CSV table of C-alpha atoms and ligand atoms in Angstrom, one decimal:
chain,number,residue,atom,x,y,z
J,21,UNK,CA,0.0,0.0,0.0
J,22,UNK,CA,0.9,3.7,0.5
J,23,UNK,CA,1.2,6.0,3.5
J,24,UNK,CA,-2.4,7.2,4.0
J,25,UNK,CA,-1.4,10.5,5.6
J,26,UNK,CA,-0.4,11.8,2.2
J,27,UNK,CA,-3.4,13.5,0.7
J,28,UNK,CA,-4.0,15.5,-2.4
J,29,UNK,CA,-3.2,18.9,-0.8
J,30,UNK,CA,-1.4,18.1,2.4
J,31,UNK,CA,-0.3,15.5,5.0
J,32,UNK,CA,-2.9,14.6,7.6
J,33,UNK,CA,-3.3,11.6,9.8
J,34,UNK,CA,-3.6,9.9,13.1
J,35,UNK,CA,-0.6,10.1,15.4
J,36,UNK,CA,1.4,7.9,15.7
J,37,UNK,CA,0.3,5.2,13.2
J,38,UNK,CA,-0.2,7.5,10.2
J,39,UNK,CA,2.1,10.4,11.2
J,40,UNK,CA,4.9,10.5,13.8
J,41,UNK,CA,8.3,12.0,14.6
J,42,UNK,CA,10.1,9.4,12.5
J,43,UNK,CA,7.9,10.1,9.5
J,44,UNK,CA,8.2,13.8,10.1
J,45,UNK,CA,12.0,13.6,10.1
J,46,UNK,CA,12.0,11.6,6.9
J,47,UNK,CA,9.6,14.1,5.3
J,48,UNK,CA,12.2,16.8,6.2
J,49,UNK,CA,14.9,14.9,4.5
J,50,UNK,CA,12.8,14.2,1.4
J,51,UNK,CA,11.6,17.8,1.2
J,52,UNK,CA,15.2,19.0,1.2
J,53,UNK,CA,15.7,17.0,-2.1
J,54,UNK,CA,12.6,18.6,-3.7
J,55,UNK,CA,13.4,22.2,-3.2
J,56,UNK,CA,15.4,24.8,-5.1
J,57,UNK,CA,18.1,26.7,-3.1
J,58,UNK,CA,17.6,28.3,0.3
J,59,UNK,CA,16.4,27.9,3.9
J,60,UNK,CA,13.1,26.4,5.0
J,61,UNK,CA,10.6,28.2,7.2
J,62,UNK,CA,8.9,26.1,9.9
J,63,UNK,CA,5.8,27.0,12.0
J,64,UNK,CA,3.2,25.1,14.0
J,65,UNK,CA,-0.3,25.4,15.4
J,66,UNK,CA,-1.6,25.1,18.9
J,67,UNK,CA,-2.0,21.3,19.0
J,68,UNK,CA,-0.1,19.6,21.8
J,69,UNK,CA,2.0,17.4,19.5
J,70,UNK,CA,2.8,20.0,16.8
J,71,UNK,CA,6.1,21.3,18.3
J,72,UNK,CA,7.7,17.8,18.4
J,73,UNK,CA,6.6,17.2,14.8
J,74,UNK,CA,8.2,20.5,13.8
J,75,UNK,CA,11.4,19.6,15.6
J,76,UNK,CA,11.5,16.3,13.8
J,77,UNK,CA,11.1,18.1,10.4
J,78,UNK,CA,13.8,20.5,11.5
J,79,UNK,CA,16.2,17.7,12.3
J,80,UNK,CA,15.6,16.0,9.0
J,81,UNK,CA,16.0,19.3,7.0
J,82,UNK,CA,19.2,20.2,8.9
J,83,UNK,CA,20.7,16.7,8.5
J,84,UNK,CA,20.2,17.4,4.7
J,85,UNK,CA,22.1,20.7,4.9
J,86,UNK,CA,19.0,23.0,5.0
J,87,UNK,CA,19.1,26.0,7.3
J,88,UNK,CA,15.8,26.2,9.2
J,89,UNK,CA,13.9,29.4,10.1
J,90,UNK,CA,11.7,28.6,13.0
J,91,UNK,CA,8.9,31.1,13.2
J,92,UNK,CA,7.3,29.3,16.1
J,93,UNK,CA,3.6,29.1,17.0
J,94,UNK,CA,1.8,30.8,14.2
J,95,UNK,CA,-1.0,30.6,11.6
J,96,UNK,CA,-0.6,28.9,8.3
J,97,UNK,CA,-0.6,32.2,6.5
J,98,UNK,CA,2.5,33.2,8.5
J,99,UNK,CA,4.4,30.3,7.0
J,100,UNK,CA,3.2,31.4,3.6
J,101,UNK,CA,4.1,35.0,4.3
J,102,UNK,CA,7.5,34.4,5.8
J,103,UNK,CA,8.5,31.8,3.2
J,104,UNK,CA,7.9,34.4,0.5
J,105,UNK,CA,9.1,37.5,2.4
J,106,UNK,CA,12.4,35.9,3.5
J,107,UNK,CA,12.9,34.4,0.0
J,108,UNK,CA,13.1,31.0,1.5
J,109,UNK,CA,13.3,27.8,-0.5
J,110,UNK,CA,10.1,26.6,1.1
J,111,UNK,CA,8.1,26.2,4.2
J,112,UNK,CA,6.1,23.7,6.3
J,113,UNK,CA,3.2,24.5,8.7
J,114,UNK,CA,2.5,21.7,11.2
J,115,UNK,CA,-1.2,21.9,11.6
J,116,UNK,CA,-4.1,19.5,12.3
J,117,UNK,CA,-6.8,21.8,11.3
J,118,UNK,CA,-10.1,20.5,12.8
J,119,UNK,CA,-9.2,16.8,12.7
J,120,UNK,CA,-9.5,14.8,16.0
J,121,UNK,CA,-7.3,15.3,19.0
J,122,UNK,CA,-5.1,12.3,18.0
J,123,UNK,CA,-4.5,13.8,14.5
J,124,UNK,CA,-1.9,16.1,13.1
J,125,UNK,CA,-0.6,17.2,9.7
J,126,UNK,CA,1.5,19.4,7.5
J,127,UNK,CA,1.1,21.9,4.7
J,128,UNK,CA,4.1,22.3,2.5
J,129,UNK,CA,5.2,25.1,0.2
J,130,UNK,CA,8.1,25.8,-2.0
J,131,UNK,CA,9.5,29.2,-3.3
J,132,UNK,CA,7.1,32.2,-3.1
J,133,UNK,CA,4.9,29.9,-0.9
J,134,UNK,CA,3.8,28.0,-4.0
J,135,UNK,CA,1.9,24.9,-3.0
J,136,UNK,CA,3.4,21.4,-2.9
J,137,UNK,CA,0.5,19.1,-3.7
J,138,UNK,CA,0.1,15.4,-4.6
J,139,UNK,CA,1.1,15.8,-8.3
J,140,UNK,CA,3.6,18.7,-7.6
J,141,UNK,CA,6.0,17.1,-5.2
J,142,UNK,CA,3.9,15.7,-2.3
J,143,UNK,CA,3.6,12.2,-3.7
J,144,UNK,CA,7.3,12.3,-4.7
J,145,UNK,CA,8.1,13.1,-1.1
J,146,UNK,CA,5.7,10.3,0.0
J,147,UNK,CA,7.5,7.8,-2.2
J,148,UNK,CA,10.9,8.8,-1.0
J,149,UNK,CA,9.8,8.6,2.6
J,150,UNK,CA,8.2,5.2,2.0
J,151,UNK,CA,11.5,3.7,0.7
J,152,UNK,CA,13.9,5.6,3.0
J,153,UNK,CA,15.6,3.2,5.4
J,154,UNK,CA,18.8,5.2,5.9
J,155,UNK,CA,20.1,5.9,9.3
J,156,UNK,CA,19.4,9.5,10.4
J,157,UNK,CA,22.3,11.8,9.7
J,158,UNK,CA,23.4,14.6,12.0
J,159,UNK,CA,22.7,18.3,11.4
J,160,UNK,CA,25.0,20.0,9.0
J,161,UNK,CA,23.0,23.3,9.1
J,162,UNK,CA,21.6,25.6,11.7
J,163,UNK,CA,18.2,26.6,13.0
J,164,UNK,CA,17.4,30.2,13.9
J,165,UNK,CA,14.4,31.4,15.8
J,166,UNK,CA,12.7,34.3,13.9
J,167,UNK,CA,9.6,35.4,15.9
J,168,UNK,CA,9.5,39.0,14.7
J,169,UNK,CA,6.1,39.6,13.2
J,170,UNK,CA,6.6,43.3,12.3
J,171,UNK,CA,6.8,42.8,8.5
J,172,UNK,CA,3.7,40.5,8.6
J,173,UNK,CA,1.7,42.9,10.7
J,174,UNK,CA,2.8,45.9,8.5
J,175,UNK,CA,1.7,43.9,5.5
J,176,UNK,CA,-1.7,43.1,7.0
J,177,UNK,CA,-2.3,46.8,7.9
J,178,UNK,CA,-1.3,47.9,4.4
J,179,UNK,CA,-4.6,46.7,3.0
J,180,UNK,CA,-6.6,49.4,4.8
J,181,UNK,CA,-6.5,53.2,5.2
J,182,UNK,CA,-6.3,53.3,9.0
J,183,UNK,CA,-7.4,57.0,9.2
J,184,UNK,CA,-10.7,56.0,7.6
J,185,UNK,CA,-11.5,53.2,10.1
J,186,UNK,CA,-14.2,53.8,12.7
J,187,UNK,CA,-14.2,52.4,16.2
J,188,UNK,CA,-16.4,49.4,15.4
J,189,UNK,CA,-17.2,46.9,18.1
J,190,UNK,CA,-16.0,43.5,16.7
J,191,UNK,CA,-16.5,40.1,18.3
J,192,UNK,CA,-13.4,37.9,17.7
J,193,UNK,CA,-13.5,34.2,18.3
J,194,UNK,CA,-10.2,32.3,17.9
J,195,UNK,CA,-11.9,29.1,19.2
J,196,UNK,CA,-8.8,28.6,21.3
J,197,UNK,CA,-6.7,28.3,18.1
J,198,UNK,CA,-4.0,30.8,17.2
J,199,UNK,CA,-5.9,33.8,15.8
J,200,UNK,CA,-6.1,35.8,19.0
J,201,UNK,CA,-2.3,36.3,19.1
J,202,UNK,CA,-2.5,38.2,15.8
J,203,UNK,CA,-5.6,40.1,16.8
J,204,UNK,CA,-3.9,41.4,19.9
J,205,UNK,CA,-0.8,42.4,17.9
J,206,UNK,CA,-3.0,44.3,15.5
J,207,UNK,CA,-5.2,45.9,18.1
J,208,UNK,CA,-2.8,48.8,19.2
J,209,UNK,CA,-2.9,49.9,15.5
J,210,UNK,CA,-6.6,49.8,15.1
J,211,UNK,CA,-9.5,51.8,16.6
J,212,UNK,CA,-11.8,48.8,17.1
J,213,UNK,CA,-13.3,47.6,20.4
J,214,UNK,CA,-12.7,43.9,20.5
J,215,UNK,CA,-15.0,41.4,22.4
J,216,UNK,CA,-12.8,38.4,22.8
J,217,UNK,CA,-14.4,34.9,22.8
J,218,UNK,CA,-12.5,31.7,23.3
J,219,UNK,CA,-9.4,33.8,22.8
J,220,UNK,CA,-6.5,32.0,24.6
J,221,UNK,CA,-4.6,29.4,22.6
J,222,UNK,CA,-5.3,26.0,24.2
J,223,UNK,CA,-4.5,22.8,22.3
J,224,UNK,CA,-6.7,20.9,24.8
J,225,UNK,CA,-9.6,22.8,23.2
J,226,UNK,CA,-11.9,23.1,26.2
J,227,UNK,CA,-14.6,24.7,24.0
J,228,UNK,CA,-14.3,22.3,21.1
J,229,UNK,CA,-11.9,21.8,18.2
J,230,UNK,CA,-12.0,25.1,16.2
J,231,UNK,CA,-14.6,24.7,13.5
J,232,UNK,CA,-17.0,27.7,13.2
J,233,UNK,CA,-19.1,25.8,10.7
J,234,UNK,CA,-20.4,23.5,13.4
J,235,UNK,CA,-23.7,25.0,14.8
J,236,UNK,CA,-22.7,24.8,18.5
J,237,UNK,CA,-19.5,26.7,17.6
J,238,UNK,CA,-21.3,29.1,15.3
J,239,UNK,CA,-23.7,30.0,18.0
J,240,UNK,CA,-21.0,31.0,20.4
J,241,UNK,CA,-20.0,33.9,18.1
J,242,UNK,CA,-23.6,34.8,17.2
J,243,UNK,CA,-24.5,35.0,20.9
J,244,UNK,CA,-21.5,37.3,21.7
J,245,UNK,CA,-22.4,39.6,18.8
J,246,UNK,CA,-26.1,39.9,19.9
J,247,UNK,CA,-25.4,40.2,23.6
J,248,UNK,CA,-22.7,42.9,23.1
J,249,UNK,CA,-24.3,44.9,20.2
J,250,UNK,CA,-21.3,44.2,18.1
J,251,UNK,CA,-21.1,45.6,14.6
J,252,UNK,CA,-20.0,42.2,13.4
J,253,UNK,CA,-18.2,39.0,14.6
J,254,UNK,CA,-15.3,37.1,13.1
J,255,UNK,CA,-14.4,33.5,13.9
J,256,UNK,CA,-11.5,31.5,12.6
J,257,UNK,CA,-10.4,27.9,12.3
J,258,UNK,CA,-7.5,26.8,14.4
J,259,UNK,CA,-4.7,27.8,12.0
J,260,UNK,CA,-6.8,30.9,11.0
J,261,UNK,CA,-6.4,30.6,7.3
J,262,UNK,CA,-10.3,30.5,7.2
J,263,UNK,CA,-12.4,33.3,8.5
J,264,UNK,CA,-16.2,33.3,9.2
J,265,UNK,CA,-18.4,36.4,9.5
J,266,UNK,CA,-21.5,37.2,11.5
J,267,UNK,CA,-23.5,40.3,11.0
J,268,UNK,CA,-24.9,42.5,13.8
J,269,UNK,CA,-28.0,40.3,14.1
J,270,UNK,CA,-25.8,37.3,14.9
J,271,UNK,CA,-26.5,35.8,11.4
J,272,UNK,CA,-23.7,33.8,9.9
J,273,UNK,CA,-23.0,35.0,6.4
J,274,UNK,CA,-22.6,32.2,3.8
J,275,UNK,CA,-19.0,32.4,2.5
J,276,UNK,CA,-20.2,32.6,-1.1
J,277,UNK,CA,-21.3,36.3,-0.5
J,278,UNK,CA,-17.9,37.2,1.0
J,279,UNK,CA,-16.2,36.5,-2.4
J,280,UNK,CA,-18.2,39.2,-4.2
J,281,UNK,CA,-18.0,41.6,-1.2
J,282,UNK,CA,-14.2,41.2,-0.9
J,283,UNK,CA,-13.7,41.5,-4.6
J,284,UNK,CA,-15.6,44.8,-4.6
J,285,UNK,CA,-13.5,46.0,-1.7
J,286,UNK,CA,-10.3,45.1,-3.4
J,287,UNK,CA,-11.3,46.4,-6.8
J,288,UNK,CA,-11.8,49.8,-5.2
J,289,UNK,CA,-8.0,49.9,-4.6
J,290,UNK,CA,-6.8,48.1,-7.7
J,291,UNK,CA,-9.2,49.1,-10.6
J,292,UNK,CA,-9.7,46.8,-13.5
J,293,UNK,CA,-8.2,43.8,-11.8
J,294,UNK,CA,-8.9,40.2,-12.4
J,295,UNK,CA,-10.6,38.1,-9.7
J,296,UNK,CA,-10.5,34.3,-9.6
J,297,UNK,CA,-13.5,32.4,-8.3
J,298,UNK,CA,-14.4,28.7,-8.1
J,299,UNK,CA,-17.2,27.0,-10.0
J,300,UNK,CA,-19.4,26.0,-7.1
J,301,UNK,CA,-21.4,29.2,-6.8
J,302,UNK,CA,-20.7,31.8,-9.4
J,303,UNK,CA,-23.5,34.2,-10.5
J,304,UNK,CA,-23.2,36.7,-7.6
J,305,UNK,CA,-19.4,36.9,-7.9
J,306,UNK,CA,-19.4,37.4,-11.6
J,307,UNK,CA,-22.0,40.2,-11.3
J,308,UNK,CA,-20.3,41.9,-8.4
J,309,UNK,CA,-16.9,41.7,-9.9
J,310,UNK,CA,-18.1,43.1,-13.2
J,311,UNK,CA,-20.1,45.9,-11.5
J,312,UNK,CA,-16.9,46.9,-9.7
J,313,UNK,CA,-15.0,47.1,-13.0
J,314,UNK,CA,-13.1,43.8,-12.5
J,315,UNK,CA,-12.8,40.8,-14.7
J,316,UNK,CA,-14.0,37.5,-13.2
J,317,UNK,CA,-11.9,34.4,-14.0
J,318,UNK,CA,-13.5,31.0,-13.5
J,319,UNK,CA,-11.2,28.4,-12.0
J,320,UNK,CA,-11.4,24.8,-10.6
J,321,UNK,CA,-11.7,24.7,-6.8
J,322,UNK,CA,-8.8,24.1,-4.6
J,323,UNK,CA,-6.1,26.4,-3.4
J,324,UNK,CA,-3.4,25.1,-5.8
J,325,UNK,CA,-5.5,25.7,-8.9
J,326,UNK,CA,-6.7,29.0,-7.6
J,327,UNK,CA,-3.2,30.3,-6.8
J,328,UNK,CA,-1.7,29.2,-10.1
J,329,UNK,CA,-4.6,30.7,-12.1
J,330,UNK,CA,-4.2,34.0,-10.1
J,331,UNK,CA,-0.5,34.0,-10.9
J,332,UNK,CA,-1.0,33.4,-14.6
J,333,UNK,CA,-3.7,36.1,-14.7
J,334,UNK,CA,-2.0,38.7,-12.4
J,335,UNK,CA,-5.3,38.5,-10.5
J,336,UNK,CA,-5.5,40.7,-7.5
J,337,UNK,CA,-7.8,38.5,-5.5
J,338,UNK,CA,-9.3,35.1,-5.5
J,339,UNK,CA,-12.0,33.6,-3.3
J,340,UNK,CA,-13.6,30.2,-2.7
J,341,UNK,CA,-17.0,29.9,-1.0
J,342,UNK,CA,-15.3,27.6,1.5
J,343,UNK,CA,-13.9,30.6,3.4
J,344,UNK,CA,-10.6,30.8,1.6
J,345,UNK,CA,-9.4,34.2,0.3
J,346,UNK,CA,-6.2,34.8,-1.7
J,347,UNK,CA,-4.4,38.0,-2.2
J,348,UNK,CA,-1.8,38.7,-4.9
J,349,UNK,CA,0.2,41.0,-2.7
J,350,UNK,CA,0.3,38.3,0.0
J,351,UNK,CA,2.4,36.0,-2.2
J,352,UNK,CA,-0.9,34.9,-3.8
J,353,UNK,CA,-1.6,33.2,-0.6
J,354,UNK,CA,-4.7,32.9,1.6
J,355,UNK,CA,-5.1,34.9,4.8
J,356,UNK,CA,-7.8,34.7,7.5
J,357,UNK,CA,-6.7,38.2,8.7
J,358,UNK,CA,-6.8,40.3,5.5
J,359,UNK,CA,-10.6,39.7,4.9
J,360,UNK,CA,-11.9,41.0,8.1
J,361,UNK,CA,-9.6,44.1,7.9
J,362,UNK,CA,-11.1,44.8,4.5
J,363,UNK,CA,-14.6,44.2,5.7
J,364,UNK,CA,-14.1,46.4,8.7
J,365,UNK,CA,-12.8,49.1,6.4
J,366,UNK,CA,-15.8,48.7,4.1
J,367,UNK,CA,-18.2,49.0,7.0
J,368,UNK,CA,-16.3,52.0,8.3
J,369,UNK,CA,-16.1,53.9,5.0
J,370,UNK,CA,-19.6,53.1,3.6
J,371,UNK,CA,-21.7,53.7,6.8
J,372,UNK,CA,-23.5,50.4,6.0
J,373,UNK,CA,-23.8,47.4,8.2
J,374,UNK,CA,-22.3,44.1,7.1
J,375,UNK,CA,-25.9,42.8,7.0
J,376,UNK,CA,-26.9,45.6,4.5
J,377,UNK,CA,-23.8,45.1,2.4
J,378,UNK,CA,-24.9,41.5,1.7
J,379,UNK,CA,-28.7,41.5,2.1
J,380,UNK,CA,-29.7,42.3,-1.5
J,381,UNK,CA,-27.1,40.0,-2.9
J,382,UNK,CA,-28.4,37.1,-0.8
J,383,UNK,CA,-31.9,37.8,-2.0
J,384,UNK,CA,-30.8,38.1,-5.6
J,385,UNK,CA,-28.7,34.9,-5.7
J,386,UNK,CA,-30.0,32.6,-2.9
J,387,UNK,CA,-28.0,29.4,-2.6
J,388,UNK,CA,-28.4,26.0,-1.0
J,389,UNK,CA,-25.2,26.1,0.9
J,390,UNK,CA,-22.8,23.2,0.3
J,391,UNK,CA,-24.6,19.9,0.9
J,392,UNK,CA,-22.4,16.8,1.2
J,393,UNK,CA,-23.4,13.3,0.2
J,394,UNK,CA,-21.6,10.0,1.0
J,395,UNK,CA,-23.4,7.6,-1.3
J,396,UNK,CA,-22.7,4.0,-2.3
J,397,UNK,CA,-21.8,4.8,-5.9
J,398,UNK,CA,-20.9,8.5,-6.6
J,399,UNK,CA,-20.6,8.0,-10.3
J,400,UNK,CA,-24.0,6.2,-10.7
J,401,UNK,CA,-25.5,8.9,-8.5
J,402,UNK,CA,-24.2,11.8,-10.6
J,403,UNK,CA,-25.4,10.0,-13.7
J,404,UNK,CA,-28.9,9.6,-12.2
J,405,UNK,CA,-29.0,13.4,-11.6
J,406,UNK,CA,-27.8,14.2,-15.2
J,407,UNK,CA,-30.2,11.7,-16.8
J,408,UNK,CA,-33.1,13.2,-14.9
J,409,UNK,CA,-32.3,16.8,-16.2
J,410,UNK,CA,-31.3,15.9,-19.7
J,411,UNK,CA,-34.6,16.8,-21.2
J,412,UNK,CA,-34.1,20.4,-20.1
J,413,UNK,CA,-30.9,20.7,-22.0
J,414,UNK,CA,-28.9,22.7,-19.4
J,415,UNK,CA,-25.6,24.4,-20.4
J,416,UNK,CA,-22.9,22.0,-19.1
J,417,UNK,CA,-19.5,22.9,-17.9
J,418,UNK,CA,-16.8,20.5,-16.6
J,419,UNK,CA,-14.3,22.8,-15.0
J,420,UNK,CA,-14.8,21.1,-11.7
J,421,UNK,CA,-17.2,18.2,-11.7
J,422,UNK,CA,-20.4,19.1,-13.4
J,423,UNK,CA,-21.9,22.6,-13.6
J,424,UNK,CA,-25.4,22.8,-15.1
J,425,UNK,CA,-27.0,26.1,-15.9
J,426,UNK,CA,-30.7,25.9,-16.6
J,427,UNK,CA,-31.3,29.6,-17.0
J,428,UNK,CA,-33.0,30.7,-13.7
J,429,UNK,CA,-31.1,28.2,-11.6
J,430,UNK,CA,-27.8,26.3,-11.7
J,431,UNK,CA,-25.9,23.6,-9.8
J,432,UNK,CA,-22.4,22.4,-9.3
J,433,UNK,CA,-21.9,18.7,-8.4
J,434,UNK,CA,-18.4,17.5,-7.8
J,435,UNK,CA,-16.3,15.0,-5.9
J,436,UNK,CA,-14.4,16.4,-3.0
J,437,UNK,CA,-10.6,16.4,-3.3
J,438,UNK,CA,-10.1,16.2,0.5
J,439,UNK,CA,-12.9,13.7,1.6
J,440,UNK,CA,-14.5,10.8,-0.3
J,441,UNK,CA,-17.7,12.8,-0.7
J,442,UNK,CA,-19.9,14.4,-3.3
J,443,UNK,CA,-20.5,18.1,-2.8
J,444,UNK,CA,-23.7,19.9,-4.1
J,445,UNK,CA,-24.3,23.6,-4.5
J,446,UNK,CA,-27.4,25.1,-6.0
J,447,UNK,CA,-28.3,28.8,-6.7
J,448,UNK,CA,-31.2,30.6,-8.4
J,449,UNK,CA,-32.0,33.9,-9.8
J,450,UNK,CA,-33.9,35.4,-6.9
J,451,UNK,CA,-36.2,32.4,-6.5
J,452,UNK,CA,-36.2,30.8,-3.0
J,453,UNK,CA,-39.0,28.3,-4.0
J,454,UNK,CA,-37.1,27.0,-7.0
J,455,UNK,CA,-34.0,26.8,-5.0
J,456,UNK,CA,-35.7,24.5,-2.5
J,457,UNK,CA,-37.6,22.3,-4.9
J,458,UNK,CA,-34.5,21.8,-7.1
J,459,UNK,CA,-32.2,21.2,-4.1
J,460,UNK,CA,-34.6,18.6,-2.8
J,461,UNK,CA,-35.0,17.0,-6.2
J,462,UNK,CA,-31.3,16.6,-6.7
J,463,UNK,CA,-30.9,15.3,-3.1
J,464,UNK,CA,-33.5,12.6,-3.7
J,465,UNK,CA,-31.7,11.6,-6.9
J,466,UNK,CA,-28.3,11.4,-5.2
J,467,UNK,CA,-29.7,9.2,-2.4
J,468,UNK,CA,-31.6,7.0,-4.8
Q,1,G6P,O1,-14.3,20.8,-1.7
Q,1,G6P,P1,-12.9,20.1,-1.5
Q,1,G6P,O2,-12.4,19.4,-2.7
Q,1,G6P,O3,-13.1,19.1,-0.4
Q,1,G6P,O4,-11.8,21.2,-0.9
Q,1,G6P,C1,-12.2,22.1,0.1
Q,1,G6P,C2,-11.0,22.9,0.5
Q,1,G6P,O5,-10.0,22.0,0.9
Q,1,G6P,C3,-8.8,22.7,1.3
Q,1,G6P,O6,-9.2,23.5,2.4
Q,1,G6P,C4,-8.3,23.6,0.2
Q,1,G6P,O7,-7.2,24.4,0.7
Q,1,G6P,C5,-9.4,24.5,-0.3
Q,1,G6P,O8,-8.9,25.2,-1.5
Q,1,G6P,C6,-10.5,23.7,-0.7
Q,1,G6P,O9,-11.6,24.5,-1.3
Q,2,CA,CA1,-7.2,26.1,8.3
């Protein structure tokens, strides 16, 4: 067989049978052979076992003659940022995301924080690690601790005109992940009043593994917003590359609508720019991008495809409905910090609430939200859906699974690249009834 921890986009598995210090050291050795010249940036999340896995990576990298830049406890975007900013050969973030307590993982990048994925180095690393029975060498290169976040913080603040910001009251919910550290470093430079929920980093996760999409976790932010009269709330996943927004009513804003909102915010600063979006939900983004004078660029989902499309297009911004937002100036990488700074600036400058910034868009392009299906036979299930709708002659697009545009409604149906699931998204042209009947119709076909 093959090592199960090696997935399409990253390394993820149970400790210690799928991932451990020995495997981590071998990954460091193997990564050294895959990179162009330079040092390697290493960072880690709040999970209890993450430092030891990072130390093992460092030992393997240094035995292979790579200098290591240890940026310490951080978010995933800090590994991206420092890898690019320091002109390093690559970087590794040790992060378990929202996998169980006995799980960990790694996200690996090369120069300019370009992703290393299954077909771009990750399976090559896997195959080297799998066959590597050599005795561990000793270090022939040094590790330096670089915990200065000044350049990173300055970069984040560069996205907004601080003199235009108003003293909004913002709920922030790190979920006991790492986001609060950055919020607190930014706060002296911002006028906002922060209401801090689940703020302290704690890899024991007394309030649940960080996952703002789970209703119990969602409700903690919503309650804080409502009880404190906050202008809006922001929650993050544990490594804070995903951000989640709650309006002043406590309502969670579906991530689809943040793509168009952020695109308009960015296009104000960079007129005429291209914006990359995924094929899951599209109509609102295309319209908002065009209305703001930008050019929308359809791309397959998944951060590696998005980033390379952005690079080839000089796109200023890209966004997925799955709470991933990519910024050209940020090494084409995703940040969970840039988006809420931009939204806070937009609320400050416009005088409009976050709710009102999205309300009409949500009415105009209502969507199902992503609905996941584990079925016995995904291919047969997709075929049943397509056969059922064939007589309507939808416009079909195969950029990522199947997108079918029927005129007043459309859907995207695709296999996930991170879980063995089918993912469905439906949207309509201002028609909530059609959305529900078509969503239920497709759901019945998929489960048939
Ligand atoms: O919908 P999936 O194929 O499961 O991918 C869902 C998400 O997985 C990871 O988080 C990637 O970084 C994202 O770019 C991707 O959108
Ligand atoms: Ca994350």
